[PDB]
Subunit: 136 residues, 3 copies
């Protein structure tokens, strides 16, 4: 099965759980796509089912919370890429980035809040990824 893809969104203003405060992981409640069921909605983590090149994209949308944030795409406790978002009232802004990375079976991909907080919720945030092609 070379068909692997997932897509998740934050669909509500709801505040960060105590677990979020603890783990600093950005959680996505609603999953539009999860072929291969390789994305664990509970931990909001993608576990690669096989060795290959995966694509990832994320947009973390925040509101005026008096805070500036930094989101990082994580690979097994290692940062791959980072995105930033300032603080102002006129609009929402997004910490967005994307990348191709090689993953091994059982490698974990997820988003971490490296800085700031997501008070006021992070509605409209998105996290998606898919296997571009596998490797031997």
């Amino acid at each position: 099965s070379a068909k692997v893809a997932f897509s998740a969104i934050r669909s509500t203003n709801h505040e960060p759980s105590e677990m979020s405060n603890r783990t600093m992981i950005i959680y996505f409640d609603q999953v539009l796509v999860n072929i291969g069921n390789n994305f664990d909605s509970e931990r909001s983590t993608f576990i690669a089912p096989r060795k290959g090149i995966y694509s990832f994209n994320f947009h973390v949308v925040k509101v005026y919370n008096r805070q500036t944030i930094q989101v990082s795409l994580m690979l097994n406790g290692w940062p791959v890429i980072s995105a930033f978002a300032g603080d102002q009232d006129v609009t929402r802004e997004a910490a967005s980035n994307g990348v191709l990375i090689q993953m091994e079976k059982g490698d974990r991909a997820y988003l971490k809040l490296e800085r700031g907080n997501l008070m006021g919720g992070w509605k409209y945030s998105t996290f998606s990824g898919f296997l571009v092609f596998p490797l031997g």
Copy 2:
């Protein structure tokens, strides 16, 4: 044919047509890619040729118009994801987002301006998408 992909850009300063004012749809005049010819440039809509997982990306670039905007990727006239863009003169701002969604044959994907306007044009804006992989009748239909 599992090869399906399209790419369109806004290449001019030109203002929104009177049609745009009514439909609130973001139109892209120049098409760089349209394999399968499933993207109709005139109405700027992607009609899925088959059931599968599709990727979509868009960057809507605006100029200072005293309004803040919200762009949404639409699936059969209902929003899937949204992007925002502030109001600023020193620079252009982009309402950007992207997502993977399941589509059925005849499902329509396009960008609609949920709020604000694009006076001053939306030059350099981009909208693209492609079939990641198809699906058979074993998979249930998507909820949207």
Copy 3:
């Protein structure tokens, strides 16, 4: 081989080289992915190994440097798409865009800084792309 993909990032605060000032090309020092080895790290340019539809994405992250910038994706010395980024101190912001384009073998893809400068470095910047599917004559 229909497997072609590359991914590069700017991992340091380091300033633009004297070469960068001349060519206006945005350079990425660290390569996360380069299947087919079609991405030249030295010149930060992707040379298409075959005719097909390629996907490209880039995020150029700048800091407060008294300048506003414009980054463009170049195809054989011609701009395809562009991105912009204002100037303010409260945060970093990114000039981001992406597109699908048809390329033939030997076509060159790279990022050029059309305006402003990247003093203060462009750390956390990203540039990636891959062959979606090939095409025949």
